[PDB]
Predict the 3D structure of the following.
Amino acid sequence: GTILIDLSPDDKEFQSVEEEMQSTVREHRDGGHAGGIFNRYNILKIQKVCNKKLWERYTHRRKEVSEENHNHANERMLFHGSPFVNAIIHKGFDERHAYIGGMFGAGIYFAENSSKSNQYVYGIGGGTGCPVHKDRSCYICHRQLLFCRVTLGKSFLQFSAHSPPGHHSVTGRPSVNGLALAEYVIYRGEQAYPEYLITYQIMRPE
Ligand SMILES: Oc1nc(-c2ccc(C(F)(F)F)cc2)nc2c1CSCC2
Ligand SMILES: [Zn+2]
């Protein structure tokens, strides 16, 4: 049921998505090993992902959460990077998209930093990089990220499966790298919706 609608660069909705993509790039502690070396992106395309079934799956769960949490879904817009982008946009988030080895357990991980998600585009740890050149820092090959609507509800704070009892998600607060943004984990696929498919290249710094 999924339809992808291209957004014009002239569209204010394209511009705010791009600004969040570009402005949440940071440097990574791996010196760019997993994700490549870059400070910014070349945005090639932004699409609205539209699927009535999967939206309604998302909002049904959102209401359940919100009623458990004084009418507060605690809804975020967060980045997701995966080798399974295509299956996510077509079938929705489920168990097969979980980062089994994640630091907060087997669940689906999301980042405030677009550049953190970028590290998972070609697999955990960047895998072996792009399929064409086997280059984790490929400046030529087209990448895709999801910009997702995420329901956090009451989130368990971790300074650094099931959500912890009485909670709907886990928040990873960075506690060493002063410039890192938060990372989040949900344990039910129904708590995220892939609103935007972003296609891009990482840009070689001058
Ligand atoms: O955007 C992200 N994606 C993944 C991720 C995606 C897919 C997979 C797998 F291939 F399914 F196993 C594993 C991990 N992990 C994280 C983030 C951003 S927050 C840091 C953790
Ligand atoms: Zn490549």
Observations:
- The first helix runs from residue 12 to 23.
- DSSP finds four helices and nine strands in the chain.
